[PDB]
Amino acid sequence: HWGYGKHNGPEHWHKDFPIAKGERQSPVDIDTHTAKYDPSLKPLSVSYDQATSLRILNNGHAFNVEFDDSQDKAVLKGGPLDGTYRLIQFHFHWGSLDGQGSEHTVDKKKYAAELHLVHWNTKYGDFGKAVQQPDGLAVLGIFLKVGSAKPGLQKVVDVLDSIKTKGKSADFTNFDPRGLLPESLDYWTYPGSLTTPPLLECVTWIVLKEPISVSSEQVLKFRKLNFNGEGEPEELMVDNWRPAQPLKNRQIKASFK
């Protein structure tokens, strides 16, 4: 099955998921000089005060922090979006080295990691329905650089030893995702896709301009995770990122001049 190795990595995915070569694939390089300021784009509204985190899961590709999405508790609105998008999970993509790991790039620059806060459009009723719609998902992408520690990330880092291998989960209640946001909500936006199979073209991407900083120790703990299940040969969970895909007939818009 698909993964990030030589024999099952991003260059192979098209054989099972032909949309991999589609018209609105993600991630992309964000060419900052060619993105256009769109003065009509609204400020984002990130309403996470009532968020209810539930669990953290190593799914063999990344780790997901899952939320209760059966009510409007943590929602994203505004910006390029029409309607209300509920937070379902967040996860990260990261590298084996500090100079790679992000999925999106900025003027070809790779960050050490990238956080995806995944939300679905409540007009479609459930996540599984939403991924079948061109405006089904809104993903807030946040770059990570290595520097000072991010205090709001530490509770996530703390629990990773409990979910080392594929299929392990742990209770993860009362986590506040507001602690993962940068100061500014300035963003780029474009229509794209899931960055993992099934690669469905259902995402409005909202990529924040300002990265967060995390420490060397925090990222090193991400890199101790395993792609494998317990009792299988150890393969470190690193370099779980898809490279930039062709922009094709898309324009990236900026919320800021």
UniProtKB/Swiss-Prot annotation:
Belongs to the alpha-carbonic anhydrase family. The record marks 89 as: Involved in the binding of some activators, including histamine and L-histidine. The modification Phosphoserine is found at residues 162, 169. It catalyses: hydrogencarbonate + H(+) = CO2 + H2O; urea = cyanamide + H2O. Activated by X-ray, histamine, L-adrenaline, L- and D-phenylalanine, L- and D-histidine, L-His-OMe and beta-Ala-His (carnosine). Keywords: Acetylation, Cell membrane, Cytoplasm, Disease variant, Lyase, Membrane, Metal-binding, Osteopetrosis, Phosphoprotein, Zinc. Residues 1-256 form the Alpha-carbonic anhydrase domain. Changing residue 15 to E: In Jogjakarta. Substrate binds at residues 195-196. It is linked to Osteopetrosis, autosomal recessive 3: A rare genetic disease characterized by abnormally dense bone, due to defective resorption of immature bone. Osteopetrosis occurs in two forms: a severe autosomal recessive form occurring in utero, infancy, or childhood, and a benign autosomal dominant form occurring in adolescence or adulthood. Recessive osteopetrosis commonly manifests in early infancy with macrocephaly, feeding difficulties, evolving blindness and deafness, bone marrow failure, severe anemia, and hepatosplenomegaly. SMART domains: Carb_anhydrase. Changing residue 4 to F: Enhanced activity. Target of drugs used in treatments against glaucoma disorder and breast cancer. Optimum pH is 6-8. SUPFAM superfamilies: Carbonic anhydrase (SSF51069). The active site is at residue 61. Changing residue 194 to F: Normal activity. GO terms for cellular component: apical part of cell; cytoplasm; cytosol; extracellular exosome; myelin sheath; plasma membrane. This is Carbonic anhydrase 2. The record marks 4, 59, 64 as: Fine-tunes the proton-transfer properties of H-64. Changing residue 103 to D: Normal CO(2) hydrase activity. InterPro entries: CA_dom, CA_dom_sf, Carbonic_anhydrase_a-class, Carbonic_anhydrase_a-class_CS. It is found in: Cytoplasm; Cell membrane. One of its GO terms (molecular function) is zinc ion binding. Changing residue 198 to A: Normal CO(2) hydrase activity, but impaired stability.
